[PDB]
């Protein structure tokens, strides 16, 4: 008995029984039942307008001619003669050779076709079982999203990723596959890896109410950030005289800057999304650099060199993006731009986020240095930025953005529209970049007028207030728990009872009503069969005031059993019979006979 997860057709799903362009949702199921031979083939592709390589399939009488060509139309837009079709141009790949069932699957550039031609007796829809064998696997490797039937009484279904339990026969033939998400019983069957279940309690997957909406709440401050002005500054200072530029209280919409300049050195070390707009971070600390060509490699965490030891050093734990672009026509001079200087000598080493300001002559000799003369060199060299230099020596313009991402008790967020707050509802929240799920209620917490978040003994966020409303609210999570299944055995019957452990019956009923529970299968939930007990909510049976011996233990003194009008019943466990001994001042019972009993 093999349990496998793959794309399958869900049991008892809606099937459209019939030329529209049906979308190819990563797997389709085709079943045609005719004797007029009207169905002849199929076409596949994305646009199918003679631009991409459209897949062509045709079955004339016995063999399926498979071609990958570029055609506007086929024979399909009193059946006496037809062999002209419409187009078969630009064929880049070639192949040759009742109840016709077909499954078409495409994955990793492989076209898989599963066929099964079972001549069922009659023409009624068969309420039976029949597996499909792999006909051919074509590695043509093309994109397919839409398909149409070809003509000269069929069903179409879409495949979904499910988990199935398959029973292989001694001669390895699949018989009587069972689903794993249809019925509560056909979940315990998958769990136990068997087709027969015994009478008793059985644990299974967990239930969890899903979020309903998603709300994003950011404080209004719509000033755009002066990123472009920093980027489009006319002149940058020396590499050792790098300009720190703090940016705050604005909108960090720098995604537009991707197009203004043709970035060639765009590396992000700590955080690298292409869509870096949902990130809220405190400090940005923009920096301005002017370096040569073969120097951008030195701008990296854990990198050493002349620049790292004398001019500028990056910390090892750097979280930011490094951006550089060519500056030949704006940072060069014909006679040499003798204005950009860099530190070259120093009797010490630099540390991250430090700047050098002293310009005294470096002491390169044992004797004390006073002016030039002996071996004393000025620790400043002017760059000879000429336009005739090579790529490795051409000056470059570099900007360093150092982020500090630790929650968000501060400003500087990307562009994102706000959304109205919702109270008393299991809704995704994005309060100022703090993301999670839960139910938000009114909080009586006395927050001092500087505290933003709030933790608990386990250090989990339990309270938050948004600046746009300045109202404190707690973050109690959405309900969840484990569910159990009650069955009286496969031999006896098939009725089952489910127990949602540790949840209120009203809450689970509300979640069932507005289609909010993850275990999409639903018990019928009739009247007077929803019982509430300390163990949980038991919607599978009715409660009876009679007392019996325990059969299937549930908990808190409640046991379930199958009685006969056959149905499952829940009752309070009985502790045996009752017998009061007739104690008296003068009365003794003496046995008059015995029994020899043997026990194992």
């Amino acid at each position: 008995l093999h349990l496998t997860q793959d794309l399958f057709l869900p049991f008892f799903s809606n099937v459209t029984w019939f030329n529209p362009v049906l979308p190819f949702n990563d797997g389709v199921y085709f079943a045609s039942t005719e004797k007029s031979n009207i169905i002849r083939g199929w076409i596949f592709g994305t646009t199918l307008d003679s631009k991409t390589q459209s897949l062509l399939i045709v079955n004339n009488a016995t063999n399926v001619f498979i071609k990958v060509c570029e055609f506007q139309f086929c024979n399909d837009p009193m059946e006496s003669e037809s062999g002209v079709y419409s187009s078969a141009n630009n064929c880049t790949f070639e192949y040759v050779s009742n109840l016709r069932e077909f499954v078409f699957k495409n994955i990793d550039g492989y076209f898989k076709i599963y066929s099964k031609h079972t001549p069922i007796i009659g023409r009624d829809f068969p309420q039976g079982f029949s597996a499909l064998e792999p006909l051919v696997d074509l590695p043509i490797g093309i994109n397919i999203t839409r398909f149409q039937t070809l003509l000269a009484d069929y069903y179409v279904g879409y495949l979904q990723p499910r988990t199935f339990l398959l029973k292989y026969n001694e001669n390895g033939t699949i018989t009587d596959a069972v689903d794993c998400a249809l019925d509560p019983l056909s979940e315990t069957k998958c769990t136990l890896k068997s087709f027969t279940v015994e009478k008793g309690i059985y644990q299974t997957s967990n239930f969890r109410v899903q979020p309903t909406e998603s709300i994003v709440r950011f404080p209004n401050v719509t000033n755009l950030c002066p990123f472009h002005e920093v980027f489009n500054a006319t002149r940058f200072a020396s590499v050792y005289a790098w300009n720190r530029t703090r940016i705050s209280n604005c909108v960090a919409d720098y995604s537009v800057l991707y197009n203004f300049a043709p970035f060639f050195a765009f590396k992000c070390y700590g955080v690298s999304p292409t869509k870096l707009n949902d990130l809220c971070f405190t400090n940005v600390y923009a920096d301005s650099f002017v370096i040569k060509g073969n120097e951008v490699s030195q701008i990296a965490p854990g990198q050493t060199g002349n620049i790292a030891d004398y001019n500028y050093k990056l910390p090892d734990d750097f979280t930011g993006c490094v951006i550089a672009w060519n500056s030949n026509k704006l940072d060069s001079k014909h006679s040499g731009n003798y204005d950009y200087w860099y530190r070259s000598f120093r009797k010490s080493k630099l540390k991250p986020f430090e700047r050098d300001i002293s310009t005294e002559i470096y002491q390169a000799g044992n004797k004390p240095c006073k002016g030039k003369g002996p071996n004393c060199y000025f620790p400043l060299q002017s760059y000879g930025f000429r336009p005739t230099y090579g790529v490795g020596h051409q000056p470059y313009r570099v900007v360093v953005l150092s982020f500090e991402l630790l929650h968000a008790p501060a400003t500087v967020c990307g562009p994102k529209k706000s959304t109205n707050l919702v109270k008393n509802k299991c809704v995704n929240f994005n309060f100022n970049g703090l993301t999670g799920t839960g139910v938000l209620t009114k909080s009586n917490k006395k927050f001092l007028p500087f505290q933003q978040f709030g933790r608990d003994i386990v250090d989990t966020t339990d309270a938050v207030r948004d600046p746009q409303t300045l109202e404190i609210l707690d973050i109690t999570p959405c309900s969840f728990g484990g569910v159990s299944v009650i069955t009286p055995g496969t031999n006896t019957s098939n009725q089952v009872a489910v127990l949602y452990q540790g949840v209120n019956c009203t809450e689970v009923s509300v979640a069932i009503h507005a289609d909010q529970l993850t275990p999409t299968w639903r018990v019928y939930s009739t009247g007077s069969n929803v019982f509430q007990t300390r163990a949980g909510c038991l919607i599978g049976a009715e409660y009876v005031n009679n007392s019996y011996e325990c059969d299937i233990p549930i908990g808190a003194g409640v046991c379930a059993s199958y009685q006969t009008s056959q149905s499952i019943i829940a009752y309070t466990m009985s502790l045996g019979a009752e017998n009061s001994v007739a104690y008296s001042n003068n009365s003794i019972a003496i046995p008059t006979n015995f029994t020899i009993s043997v026990t194992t």
Partner: protein, 309 residues
Amino acid sequence: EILPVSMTKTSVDCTMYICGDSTECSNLLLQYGSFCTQLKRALTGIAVEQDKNTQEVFAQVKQIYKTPPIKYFGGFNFSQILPDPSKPSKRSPIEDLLFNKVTFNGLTVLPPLLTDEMIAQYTSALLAGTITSGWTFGAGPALQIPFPMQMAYRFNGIGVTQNVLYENQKLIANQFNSAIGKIQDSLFSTPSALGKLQDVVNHNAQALNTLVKQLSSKFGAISSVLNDILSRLDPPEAEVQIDRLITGRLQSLQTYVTQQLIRAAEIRASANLAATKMSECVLGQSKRVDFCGKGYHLMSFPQSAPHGV
């Protein structure tokens, strides 16, 4: 004499604990074999072991025995141990003192199968059978016998002739009454009498607290929260961080499960000892030295306690 009998039944959801409802984390966890299945099986085994422990300890009686309305037993008091109808749950005053003296992220505590009222009912039935039918009800059908005659038989059981009891019945009854009275004061004034049960509760609480607290450890990753890492990098880079967090949390779960298994084995041994004591010390007179008390044993009375007897 106090003996632990049971432990809190806990069930842990492996997927929710390791992965905070993230599909990408679940896909990576899926390649780590059947670890979560093993953990769930071990926890279920522990829970059913606890249920069997309490079932074996307290359900040794066949039929529920009811004491007669009039409660004269030749001067013996038997008030602090018999249930008092003038209160809910029908618990004896000593049981009342015992109960009044003692006292999130995928973790669930399952309630015990037998409620405390059922345990109290078993205790009352056992005590009534002991005081009415003597020790005969444990070896077959219950046979009525006056209490002074049962006490005379028990005196004969330790090499003392029965005339002593009929000679000093009043003195012996007064001595027993005073001794049973002093127990209430001993358990009231002294606050640490029930040390072992509270120790078990504290151990379980500490284990749970450590398990929940270790969810905040980075384990050498960017952050301790999955969702932030997911919405911070492309999946290929975030995979390493997800894997590190998964390994750390899985190790934490394995350690917790192993510790719970060892504690469950210890409590199983204690429950077997308690069941043996109830079978021998209560349902009869034991000649084993220093087993049913300190001295020549006469009789015993059980009293229900939270996760113990």
